[PDB]
């Protein structure tokens, strides 16, 4: 899509005294992290070393804007997910609650122990309010 492109650019103005957009492979992810997907140092050494590999690995626009074209492709979710959320959230509170997850699980076929449910909420929980807000459900679903 278009928006799944226009966004990216904004990142190219965060932290790089290169001026004319030019970071490195020693601070590339610093952008992807702050953005979406989150790969490891192992999935960052061979992806980059392919398209633009001269001497100092020039990093700019026609590059990154291209890398995501395959990583941020099959995982074109975000939508395929934000709706998963609305499913567990039968209350409409905006956040998933212990119960909310049980009700959904006890129907997909797996009778969950009143213990586990409360453990899946806690682990999935990040800000620690006792329930998962959309943002958390996102994180919990990718990172």
């Amino acid at each position: 899509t278009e928006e799944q492109i226009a966004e990216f650019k904004e990142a190219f103005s965060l932290f790089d005294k290169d001026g004319d957009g030019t970071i490195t492979t020693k601070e590339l992810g610093t952008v992807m992290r702050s953005l979406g997907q989150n790969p490891t140092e192992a999935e960052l050494q061979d992806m980059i070393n392919e398209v633009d590999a001269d001497g100092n690995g020039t990093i700019d626009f026609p590059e990154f804007l291209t890398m995501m074209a395959r990583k941020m492709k099959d995982t074109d979710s975000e939508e395929e997910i934000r709706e998963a959320f609305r499913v567990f959230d039968k209350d409409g509170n905006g956040y998933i609650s212990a119960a909310e997850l049980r009700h959904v699980m006890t129907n997909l076929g797996e009778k969950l122990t009143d213990e586990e449910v409360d453990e899946m909420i806690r682990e999935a929980d990040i800000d620690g309010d006792g329930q998962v807000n959309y943002e958390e459900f996102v994180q919990m679903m990718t990172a």
């Binding site: 966004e7 702050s34 979710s77 499913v87 129907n107 076929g109 990040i126 943002e135």
Partner: protein, 481 residues
Amino acid sequence: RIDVLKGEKALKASGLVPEHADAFKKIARELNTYILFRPVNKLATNLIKSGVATKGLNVHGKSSDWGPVAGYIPFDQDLSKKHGQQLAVEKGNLENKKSITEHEGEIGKIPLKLDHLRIEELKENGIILKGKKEIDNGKKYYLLESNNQVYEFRISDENNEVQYKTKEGKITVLGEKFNWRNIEVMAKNVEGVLKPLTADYDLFALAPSLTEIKKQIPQKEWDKVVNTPNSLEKQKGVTNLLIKYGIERKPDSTKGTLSNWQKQMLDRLNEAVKYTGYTGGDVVNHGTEQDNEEFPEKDNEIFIINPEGEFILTKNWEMTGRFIEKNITGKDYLYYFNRSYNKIAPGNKAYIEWTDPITKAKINTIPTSAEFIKNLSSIRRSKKIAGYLSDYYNSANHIFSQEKKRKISIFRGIQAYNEIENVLKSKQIAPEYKNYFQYLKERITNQVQLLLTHQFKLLYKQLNFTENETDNFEVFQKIID
């Protein structure tokens, strides 16, 4: 309670052929899934019962609800229900032109032939009346009457083909004035002969029981993520199975954009009708309205067949959405709403509102980094804060206890409230962005002040103002309790 129509009074108001709406309860109760249809041109009903073929996706010509061509799809879409709005009619045509040309063979057009039996039907619904006897160049006609102020029609006593002209003086939407010519209607090629098209059934939505999506998931593929030793990603695998066999809808090419439990559904519905003797192929034939994002449509009445075989008919959008809220999205059934709701649909500039729970709870939740970039994105008409946000939501808190979680987060939360103040106090750059950081504040504020609502109401004019590193987090250690 809600002011809704139940029973026959609804089926009757749905336009759905009664004998079919009946066959539908069958599948509604059988598959424990609600089946909601959008309207259906009523003058199209008996035509469908009659057996008239229904338009697919290669025909986007709106049918007519008036005149003798009422029921069928006039090739001249100025005879269809859009009769009047120019840009509309203009698009109606092009769409039909694309049908005839882009599909030479499958789609075409035949002349309108109303028989002694359809004249009557139209007569009762008070659509057109058989008038005088006119004689033009050796052939007899009967002026077909209509409350219309632009065209005039007739039928031949010979072949029964209807013709029409623009009345004297009056002018067509386009600027055309012509004389006695045939009303052509969109056809479909079936076995070498050309047959006429008519309104199909438009699913507004399909909501199965969550218990139903199970049967869709392979009793293998499930046990894996289920019996996962973990208890973290184990949820992800559960949700992601829900997402695959529950949602991520794809192009069929002909059926539109639907899922696989929807494609299977469609067939069940059509098998149903065919068993009632409907000679004319499929009746329901492209995916549901919730996947129609480009040109979404809001109707005032949605016919509903619940998993109990009952007939409801919401009377207004405010209702149709209140129903689904209470009976479907909050009762353990799978339901999703059009991606282009609450947005400005691109294709038709449509603005359909719907309650999205994720938005309600927004003024109390602080944005992730990406969310913060996107927010920086689509506002670029004319820094470093993204960090303190990828800090708040650090998926690696999964080892901490709520007590700790609520703390470092309350901190990381005020951390950002800082950078988002070092700006509103800096150069005035753009009043467009300033009206955003204000939001963040109120948001960033509200969430923190919600966590602390366990242990603050002004504890900020003291805490670390301006130093840095790890000592700051130390001072906080006590500012708390």
